[PDB]
Design a protein around this nucleic acid. Sequence first.
DNA 1: TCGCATAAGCAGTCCGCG
DNA 2: GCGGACTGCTTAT
Length: 901
Amino acid sequence: MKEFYLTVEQIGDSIFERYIDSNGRERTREVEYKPSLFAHCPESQATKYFDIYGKPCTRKLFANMRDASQWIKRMEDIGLEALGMDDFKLAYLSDTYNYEIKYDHTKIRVANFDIEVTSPDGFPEPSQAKHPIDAITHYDSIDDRFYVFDLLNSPYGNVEEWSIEIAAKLQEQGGDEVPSEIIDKIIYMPFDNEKELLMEYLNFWQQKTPVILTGWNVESFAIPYVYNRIKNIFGESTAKRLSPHRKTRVKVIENMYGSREIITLFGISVLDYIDLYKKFSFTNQPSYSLDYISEFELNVGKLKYDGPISKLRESNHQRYISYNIIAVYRVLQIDAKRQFINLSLDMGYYAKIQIQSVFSPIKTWDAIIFNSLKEQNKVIPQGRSHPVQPYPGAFVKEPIPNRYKYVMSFDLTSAYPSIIRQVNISPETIAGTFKVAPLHDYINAVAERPSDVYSCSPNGMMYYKDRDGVVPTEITKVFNQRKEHKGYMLAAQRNGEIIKEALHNPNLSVDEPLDVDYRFDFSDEIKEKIKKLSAKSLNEMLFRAQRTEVAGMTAQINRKALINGLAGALGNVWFRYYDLRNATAITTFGQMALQWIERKVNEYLNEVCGTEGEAFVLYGDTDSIYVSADKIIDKVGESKFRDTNHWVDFLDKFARERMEPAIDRGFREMCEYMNNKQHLMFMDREAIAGPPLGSKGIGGFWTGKKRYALNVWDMEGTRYAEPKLKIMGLETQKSSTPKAVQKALKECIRRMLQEGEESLQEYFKEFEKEFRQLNYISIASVSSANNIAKYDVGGFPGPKCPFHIRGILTYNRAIKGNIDAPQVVEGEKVYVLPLREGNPFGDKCIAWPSGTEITDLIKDDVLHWMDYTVLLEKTFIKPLEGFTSAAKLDYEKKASLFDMF
DNA sequence: TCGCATAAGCAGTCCGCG
DNA sequence: GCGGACTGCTTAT
Ligand SMILES: Nc1nc2c(ncn2[C@H]2C[C@H](O)[C@@H](COP(=O)(O)OP(=O)(O)OP(=O)(O)O)O2)c(=O)[nH]1
Ligand SMILES: [Ca+2]
Ligand SMILES: [Ca+2]
Ligand SMILES: [Ca+2]
Ligand SMILES: [Ca+2]
Ligand SMILES: [Ca+2]
């Protein structure tokens, strides 16, 4: 096989590399890599190296990496550009793997681990590590085994061995329900003392050294705890055995309000799953506890135990160990679904970076571009210092707040990356500038043509047309990957809808799910068999179809995120190719494209309807337009349609055969006007929205910018078995909104859009009457909590104290003195409840750590003093009043003359 | 919240507004 | 009460 790196490090003058050799074996080597950097040289000097602007360079070969680094310093002292890849391990990988990397994941050791630490005096601080590690479960992807290290003897209690038999039994048998599919994969090792547990763990680690190391909060908790505990018991040298090169570094992670420490293990790639999830999931969660995320992702119930975690080992060691094992398995289950490890490996190997660098789009793009340019013997410019400066972004149209009955939406495929490609925006393709007219003059095609030679953006920038820039070239490659995966995602989605339809009529038989590839649209053959399947088989097929869709979503959306990140990176001062001329060329072109095409669509529709000055485009944001289709429907007449699907077909056909060719023509003209390199503005129909045929539903509404709801029947070619709500920006979509309130508001919106005013009034009346019975967690607000100290004045709110921070200070006073009560962690999330006047907490609200039950010390007082009235008005009534006034209807029935009877 | 970008919404504080 | 100046937080794209 072709060789591939696993990890790469610079240690002084050596590159340390773990890799897979041509025989599939893991190896390690130390290489005295001689880096090359570059200086500009005279024209008379013959060379094959040129910088990105075509200026000649001489290559400087250094005796070692430190010499190269020192040379960079002296060049700065002199005041001359030191060109080339200054991150020598990236240059090493580029030299050593000069081909597209084909990797084999089965050879990559992926370790998933979790530790337990009993602590009587609150949270066990990893930097102190003063409490024994009493359990480690370490899953190894190569062995496919869970290695369980169990401490039987501790200062906090002596316990009996964990029992695998009890672990396997149902909760109803007094067991722990460790999933049967992992029971045979557990390798259990009890220890009589912590020293032997840890020594054996290190020996084990030496035999099975992780390449990718993951788990939940491992970078912030488990790794520094294990490192520091081993350090405290045995000394530094022993702790450094966690690194295959015996090198570690305390790295200080700084943010706006404070800093924290992690342990860098040289020769290991740490991909903490919490951070993978935050980057790649595109969710914003009320809590990031593993219990909360596991429930959300997998629909598994919370791991249930009595008493505090600090007493679980002594009271129920059996459950203590089983829950440690299950916790590791939960992360593997989330990854089986979401496939974030797979994504990380894909992206890292494509870019030729350390896998952990996938968290940084700047680093990722720096490596992609470097490798691309190196292939042509071109030399990358030195990174430079720039002051942070604001720059303009997208245009967003101010909508008239209203109901909107029939709506068709359109938006650009991969807008910003497509703009980059169309205009040819790149550091080395800048050709000059032209004299800019007000933006509206381009929007209206009255401004003079910018250039008859170069490709232009309305911010004043001109670009070469003779050759593609490196940025367009490399962005196109990832875009193409993205498009492939989105295709699979949409196919799985359409396939899911076929299964849902079939589930209306399940057959009474015993059969099996069909063995199919859900990434491809079901054939007629498959559709026929589906219509004969049982509900059991159909539900399993649906599950598989949805898993396939999830896998496609992960692959496509994060590739979309990467290419959009390149557009953003051009506006980040740490990017090697930072240039506000290019960043603004993208955004300003975007502003023009939207407003240009708004004008074109209005003109086209005013002509087909024979009207004048009529606005068909009601809204748009960045790269999208929302078109009122009421007049299109009314030109046919509602009574001509057999059912909802009939008018949806008509609008879909209208969008595809009339709207889109008109849109394409408008954009082709715009391309010629800007003299762009290639027409790539592809604005396809997104949504077709409206009320169910013959209902009193309103179809959709806008309250304002970035705030709307649509009843959608077809989304990017997916025809739903059941209508789906597209709700953007409203409180139903905000993690800060109480869970039960999100649900109630969504149902209010559903009723507005599908059924009408009277239905909405029925539901509001009922919700208002019953809501006090809702569980307190379900009706609590959520907020991130920053700067708790800033607003804390002797345990009380300082000036301008935010509401949620006030709540935390209330909590802090209420639990004062307790070393055991859960502490609110700076920067994490809290649940927030208002408190009625005259409560014993002495303030108007209380907050506690999100994803948790409030401590029993105060729970009862909180429940007793909860202000349901304030809660209802703020989270439910206020937003609903907003939705309904915008939509011009009433959530409460107004009096009429019929009341006289 | 270490990790690409800007636009823009709403909650809440403080305080004016005769 | 509401709204503006401001902070804080959270979305849409
Ligand atoms: N820098 C940056 N720009 C973004 C981000 N999200 C959206 N944008 C910008 C760039 C996008 O091309 C543009 C339109 O966003 P969309 O959500 O419509 O995505 P896009 O058109 O890229 O892909 P699509 O083909 O519509 O799925 O808005 C982001 O997270 N970072
Ligand atoms: Ca635990
Ligand atoms: Ca788009
Ligand atoms: Ca599309
Ligand atoms: Ca059937
Ligand atoms: Ca869009």
